Amino acid sequence: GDGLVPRGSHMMEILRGSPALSAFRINKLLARFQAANLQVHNIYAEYVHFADLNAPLNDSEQAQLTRLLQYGPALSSHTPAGKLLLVTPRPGTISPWSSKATDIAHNCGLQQVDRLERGVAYYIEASTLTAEQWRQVAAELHDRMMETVFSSLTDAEKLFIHHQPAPVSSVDLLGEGRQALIDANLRLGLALAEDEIDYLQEAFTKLGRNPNDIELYMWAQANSEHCRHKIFNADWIIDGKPQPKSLFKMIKNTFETTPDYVLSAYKDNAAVMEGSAVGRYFADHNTGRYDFHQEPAHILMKVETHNHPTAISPWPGAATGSGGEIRDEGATGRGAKPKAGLVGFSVSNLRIPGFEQPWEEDFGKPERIVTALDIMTEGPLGGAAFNNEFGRPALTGYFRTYEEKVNSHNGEELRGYHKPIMLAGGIGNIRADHVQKGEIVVGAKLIVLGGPAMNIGLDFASVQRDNPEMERRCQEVIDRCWQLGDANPILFIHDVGAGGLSNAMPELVSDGGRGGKFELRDILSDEPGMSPLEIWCNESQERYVLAVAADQLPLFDELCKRERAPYAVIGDATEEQHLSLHDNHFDNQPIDLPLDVLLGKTPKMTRDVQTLKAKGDALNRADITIADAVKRVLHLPTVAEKTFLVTIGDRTVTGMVARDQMVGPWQVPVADCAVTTASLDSYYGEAMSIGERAPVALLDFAASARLAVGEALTNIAATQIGDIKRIKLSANWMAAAGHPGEDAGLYDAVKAVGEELCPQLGLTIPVGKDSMSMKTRWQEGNEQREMTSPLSLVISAFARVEDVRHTLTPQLSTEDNALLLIDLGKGHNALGATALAQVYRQLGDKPADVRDVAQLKGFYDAMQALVAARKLLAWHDRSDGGLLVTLAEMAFAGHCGVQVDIAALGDDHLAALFNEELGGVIQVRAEDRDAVEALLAQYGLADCVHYLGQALAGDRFVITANDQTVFSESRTTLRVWWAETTWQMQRLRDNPQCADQEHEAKANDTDPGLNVKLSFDINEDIAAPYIATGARPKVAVLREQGVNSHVEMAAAFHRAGFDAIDVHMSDLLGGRIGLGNFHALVACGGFSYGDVLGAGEGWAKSILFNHRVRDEFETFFHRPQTLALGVCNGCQMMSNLRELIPGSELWPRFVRNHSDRFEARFSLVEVTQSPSLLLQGMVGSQMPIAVSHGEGRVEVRDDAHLAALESKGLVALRYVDNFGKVTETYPANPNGSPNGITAVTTENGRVTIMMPHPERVFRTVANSWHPENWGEDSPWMRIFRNARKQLG
Template identity: 55%
Template sequence: MTRRCRQHLPRGPAFLVTPRIGTISPWSSKATDIAHNCGLDAVRRIERGVVYAIELNRPLMLIERNAIAAALHDRMTESVALESELERMFGHHAPAPLVTVPLGADARAALARANVELGLALADDEIDYLADAYATLGRDPTDAELVMFAQANSEHCRHKIFNAEFVVDGEPQPQSLFAMIRETHRANPQHTLSAYSDNAAVMAGATVPRWYPRDSVGGREYGYSDEPVHTLMKVETHNHPTAIAPFAGAATGAGGEIRDEGATGLGAKPKAGLCGFSTSHLRVPGVNLPWEADAIGKPDRIVSALQIMLDGPIGAAAFNNEFGRPNLAGYFRTFEQTVDGRVRGYHKPIMIAGGIGNVAEPHVLKHGFPAGSLLIQLGGPALRIGLGGGAASSLATGANAADLDFDSVQRGNPEIQRRAQEVIDRCWQMGESNPILLIHDVGAGGLSNAFPELAHSAGCGARFELRKIPNEEPGMSPMEVWCNEAQERYVLAIAPDKLAAFTLICERERCPFAVVGTATSETQLVVNDSQFGNRPVDLPLDVLLGKPPKMRREVTRVQPQGDSFGNKDAGLRNPARALTGSELKAAVLDVLRHPTVGDKTWLITIGDRTVGGQTARDQLVGPWQVPVADVAVTTLGFRTLQGEAFAMGERSPIAVLDGPASGRMAIGEAITNLAAADVPSLQHVKLSANWMAACGQPGEDAALFDTVKAVALDFCPALGVAIPVGKDSLSMTTRWRADAAAEGSEHVVSSPLSLIVSAFAPVGDASATLTPLLRQGDSRLLLVDLGRGKHRLGGSIYAQTRGRIGDNPPDCKSPARLKAFFDAVRALAREGRILAYHDRSDGGLIATVAEMLFAARLGATLDCNADDIAGWLFNEELGAVLQVAESNVDAVLRAFSLAGLGAAVSMIGTVEASSRLLLRHKGTPLLAFERSELLAAWRETGHAMQRLRDHPDCADQEHARALGDVPGLSATLSFDPHATPAAPYIGRAVRPKVAILREQGVNGQLEMAAAFDAAGFAAIDVHMSDIIAGRINLRDFRGLAACGGFSYGDVLGAGQGWAKSIRFNERARDTLAAFFRRTDTFSLGVCNGCQMMAGLAELIPGAAHWPRFVRNRSEQFEARLSLVEILESPSILLAGMAGSTLPVVVSHGEGRAWFADPRDLDGVRVAMRYVDGHGQPTEAYPDNPNGSPGGITAVTTHDGRATILMPHPERVFRSVQMSWRPDTWGEQSPWARLFANARVWVG
């Protein structure tokens, strides 16, 4: 530590927190990249540390020092170092040697000891199998071989329970769980192109103009290609790591699932994601929810549900944001309850990540490759993280040593995964010349699982050289190098004659890769180690991936008891009597306060939902952007309205009472959600089934078997839907001892059987999606009750808020009725007879209607004619509420009657232009709520969580705005949006070139190129490496657009690494400066490009007063649809638009304009600013999402040729891309004018 640094610290002990000694952090890699790209080639490595100084009036005792040090660092990635130890950070660490496990005279006993010491999670029969195998081989195993075998054959990787032979109540069962799941595809294979054989399933898409860059004279020009574009789908879980380190666990869960998508077929394009969480009770400080009162505690090795939900969603969002994938759907459930003397809950949480992508028709299926093919690792380096993750995830939490649990968690670096995906994109964009012969992602087990899978799927063996694996922790042992689960890696095979072309792609994208091995005709797996001259691995592949012993599970059914909570049971002292008005009111508010029902804004605005430019329906609905959408919808391209839809369903509390019912209800909920989208038919719907269970607990295995059987052999075939993809996580038990020394003090928390269903389907018109947004005018609210008046309350949120579970849950035993509902809703929607739609689920009818009122800021009168008003309000039977114009009511009732659902439909109320919800019972007014009262209850938990996580002042401002009577989004235009000023130029044979400029980590280039193409430009893909290498010099370009994303992962400040790599690289600086000086050019910087160009102000004429952009005031990434006013300015891009107020997408973490010299605020040319619903400039959150002074969000130069802005007009140049828009807008949104202005100016 320098003397200058020490002078600024208080007197007292200092703690230096650095990356773990012997490791190289992702921050260091990116900072070093910046230095090298600035021409500082002599810099070997840049690293950062944090100094914590404590001012004390006495010396610290050793125990205090150790406690403080432990609290200040994450021991997975950090060390607390003394000043004298800092040199060790940059020192050389000798590799640890290979370890051989001596079997001796009792091989089985030796393997059993290794099983415990290495955390292998091997079953007894697997230990016997290995003992026999090594007896045959005649040698001792290495630790690398044992850990590799454990990962490859873990429950996590091999799904042993799903492939097991089941004996239920003494009766052998003819099919395994997985065999039954396969029956859904056998019964309904139509529209499925790939199932069960790859990283993801693929369903048929459509032939559309697909947009991507291709090689051409003068650079890689973007263009459209009419070709079949198919849709892949995948959903994964990452439960175990999220329990231990929520941010990292959720981040790498999202990242791993994204890699699954990219590694589908021969390379694919991830597109849009989903994310969900189930936890035990949050117990938020200051939020009194009576049903959360009894706390059983938790083991020290895992974090609390509160911490999971403060950190986990941020981790998942951060990875998606930085990689560049919008997250458009999800769920959140809390459940923790003692039932039949057992504590049921999610101490081991569910963290689910999934999504869709696109794949070209020639690349849908994987193929083999011949011996001699090169085996390549693409992506990041080996790191000592995630060791044994597959095995650890296969154990009940608490069954593994704490250190091994901790070591099994990975750490993510999304920026390098983005680089790897760009390489994959360049490969599939080559069409038939795609160099990829086979590709897999690196997940559980690391390379030790991925490379053997790669070779085995091609029927080959392989030989590898361990020291060719890129490695940033040279002190690792051979086992650690081979088996670590460092993220952001892929393995692939290419032909030797394609290596030169592949190398050029990787060099252009600055993506590390290495040829690690070669495929062999002999099916032997050999890993050589030139460092020590030995072989850490030398095994026949059939020993590793052959047929170890098949599991046999003898299980017994246990009849759940539940409790007597019924339709007339209020959970009060006299359960038989009806609720009074005050009791009913309290019950309504409690249901809305439950975190499962309540507002999810705090989980949604942290995630980018528009990157890629193909989002048509996200979670936020209407002018007030309320998170109540039923379904996510994307488009297949920028010249089509065809696309994809996906939605989720899960009803796990029901499984405590009836497993098969919970499975049917989960599928039903997913389908009633999906019905909001323009899906052709149920036969086009594909499901992902993700199964969680506490296997080994009484009755749970049998319940799992019965639920899979009910869903796969009966329900899905009858519906006509298939389950071509899914995952299982069957160790959902947490056990610990409150007092390690005490006998009999073990606590056990086991999750309910949990089927999480994600439904996917093609969409004919992405702009025709139904939403819960109510409309004013004469209309009726109709309830379609697929429960046919049963009003069952078992497992409901209402029951949970009363501390009960019930004994009679809802069910869907008539797939024909569900199918008729789906078909009727879709037919009515296509006829334009439904104004608003919202499915009934958690919280029941009252939650459904309340959310519709919140979205539209309207009121309603509800009429209950049932005797049991609590059952009518709170039951969670399948169904939906429809708003139908008075003129269409008869037609809608007739359509449902013809579908056989006439008895299921009732008119339940009317919509009013008021702020009140009136509840009437058999015509008599019973209760009246102010909408703000309901909204305050609905927002309570979310507001409290936001205050804990983000800047509390911002959280309070948003809460006050939500409850206030404030206008929502609107649009006021000073120009005709239907005019086409660029039309005369668009058809010309020679189109002016615009450089779509990107740096490593940038992810917004596709939509930027499409927006300029629509205005008549030739959009050229330009990477900074092209400029630095001299391949492109910009002399023949008229425009430059710097795109959004996370260049260098925002290391050294958002956009600043990118700016510095230009300013301090002579060729890059001269090239950009010459371009900016030319008076026939224009420049646009958006988001990360805006931040970068602000850092180049000294090179841009007329930009001297530009601000820098720093961390948002909320201290959080903000993704919103914000209202901006376009000001009078010289900007050529905003010509003729001044005076307009328009909604526009914002997605950034560092968007607050900051002026080093306050006088610059007076001199800067402001082109755009945030305004509130009244059209007034604002600094108030969230109308101003970052806190910029005066609402500043765009500035320009004195001549208007260079304009930078934090919002994303390129993501909303089509009307379909906006989550809310006026009904009068056409195909192009008013933001298309910005790009048309550029074309007109160029002439």
């Protein structure tokens, strides 16, 4: 029995959970203790759960809560032995696990559960340790920024203390004069300048009353660099001359020059451009039926950063970087839908233990920030965690490491990224009539949509918190709103970000020309102790603010309750330009201000600065040889394979991904840009690419900015766009403002792109952001040390795509071919600030640059001509690592060799191979060489174009210069060297057995890559005679909160002839839908409940513990002809419903992958013989499918049960390796399932559950790789057509 004790006015139940760490993780902890000379004999860990109860549980309810808290892999249980150390979230914080677990308990009828929380009990046997050594063990077992260690289970009562509300505090300006403001500036950390204090002193002296702490804090956050963008609005004097434009006005110059296709710039928290008229697919409000709505799907774009918080706590730093940016996209106009993301990281050197590289030197770091390696281990996991649980694919990115002592603009100093760049961005779609914000009527209701707040954000104040499923529930309300078209009730919406409601609400009513009257105690709160300052100014996540007409509140409440999206009306818009915040608890008014006070500011800044310019130093080549440089450059993280950043993030949710990072049958992550379809019924789409080249700014500020723009365009150039004016840019500027030379260099770089290169090319920059404190200082010896970033412009390019099918990738063909270099460097072959210089600890002399603007435009326009005429077999641009890395990566992606001659590229073979000038390599059919050279010559490119040679079958990578061999190596050896960084990252972050299997597989050149064998005609629509009758059977497309894959599931059943109906679990609980009216149902994928309490478990136990809904599902599954499919999260849910499903007694559980990591893979499976009616006709076929899950490993009770499942013949799909054999080796089997199993059916074949996603790849265009001869339908369309034909 579980523990039960008094806890304040409540009772606290303590429930023992399952064992918490796998064998490999226990071994790593033992190894770390041994490495610290901590003599630890054994460690075992178990989860422990704490339930704060507001009322007692009866026996039945106690058994339900016990069953809710049974989840996870069935690991080795041990009797507790040794010293207990209980690690929990810090008191005063509430984990996201708690928010979601508590939501499951309430949706299971346990309203007595006020809050659930979890810790980890470690039992350590180490009898000889001293007291100081026990503190070191404790330090090893928790994150000091987020957790605490306790010595008894009962200490967890500290996490549930209820504090009385703290009152507002007055700052006594009337009674003390200006010193009260000086004291408050220090006490509250307002970082006010003297002229900011003068402004506040006069404003309150004029009002004749003391400011409250909340009103000072709100104003300080509104007037910070971060929020007010004073540097980008400043006036400048440079070298003694006043300049005519601010940095923002030079950005806006690009929209004054090129307004084409722009629908919204600089007036929302994303830009919008024109898209394409296509079928937007969603379920109608009245009927619940999914349908296509033919209309423009315009395209929104935004890119943000989260640099400071990621230096302190990288997982939530990066997660809430993604999360914040997703809210900016959904809050565009009057509501919009995010569709695909991008991610970037810049960090200092990794210094992976046991894999030190020769250019890396430990310079030390501040105590209070984490290392570059910790950022790259936990940060990409947090950004992926948000994109995967919210449900947007993450399809392009960058990752740079840089940290070196260099002779730059301010002479010799350390330049790097101890404060990293953490960048998150994406694209979304929006309806034309919702692009413009609406008018806010006087008396509009002012709402906060989203998460109850806590005291987050005000280094503890820099530790963020992410709950992506809350954001998905809010996106579903936003989507119901814009799907109502003219009846959309949102008049105005805005994300909540910096400053919390203290910035978002004043900005909302101000942007509508109104004031606002608000009620503090109507805001939802999970921390009753919070003061009015903490309630109004915290930066809790997953919130939006909205205005809605009072007469639309009943509709808005219906939409929210159906999605389980929390919301509160907290105020009313007023005609008076005033802002007031009242407190019904203290019967007072924490804020009472004219908006022109609140939104008043100090004068415009002037920045008077001078130019600094480094003299470059020629590269010292004494210890450089071509062969050693190839090996070093392939080991630079910036160049090396990025799998560890790619397969951790879904790349298929939505079913609209055409081109992801992984390319070809060997799934090599070298795609130069991302492409999505605009709908599920079109080949129009959208593309995203990134350019960045920060190390060049250590030699030439403007050259680094022009190369960022040029590389974004060379990355996107082999996608079918047409007019260069379709491409729109985000410009994200990271600098150390104030550091010598960086200010004049920022202005020079903004002018270089905004006044010069982008207007000359026809490129708009309609959105951007800036982060202006990119440096770190600490005391290292008893000496001051500093690490300052280069000026770091990241350009993201976004474009409407005219046909996604015509995109080229770096996969070489071995058909008769020609490789052509387009060298936009014009033979300059610069080596300054290249990966070659960096790997020999140098900066060099002169960097690359845009050498000829008309030739850059001509190269783009020539590429677009060649793409549209279908004249290219492959493209890959030149960037980090030069021509050598471009050619190596094309041979990796084509799994072949190259024979290249570089005698035309200069006598300096090192510079010809390793310069990072713009350009790239095209591959064409040999019969088309002369035509393509003439086409390039009509764009002015003839002297830039050079025939290099040919791609050849086999494994030789050969570069010659006339009769001399310059470099020759096995392509497999190069490919494995270029994989060693991801190998080492995966092996320190994930199960090392799996990291090792994936790496070693790359060294087998005989791998034939993904390949297909089909047992049926993929073009035969067996459902066509039924569709032609017009009789369309319904399918219940089942979703729970946190499901994210329902739209494409409905679209696959719709193509097979069904009427797809949106059935939320709330519809079944509210009686709006009854399963008796359906003959088919599908449980869809995603992250219901964030997978807390085990993937699929909350959704299944919600059904089981409501007897009415339980019986509905049992009745459905017991009818004689009904069909059901569960995919991914649906598979997990239905495996937890066995008890309701006949013929399911042998089904396994689905638990954490053996790798211990989310796996987003394009995996090969074979269809096996089973009763499944949904796989009729397909037995023996082998083809790839989208895999995207963290808990897909089949787990049985013991081998008796595996053998029985097998002998009953219910396995319907198995993972196979590329040789065709059933496998458990990773990642060909991505999850470790026994015998490759990844789909099972019932004895009667009418219910099938599977972990992969056929509905993400039912369109050939959405398959990462596929045979060239396939038509619109992939093989997986046959599952949906078999369901239609079976219904008859």
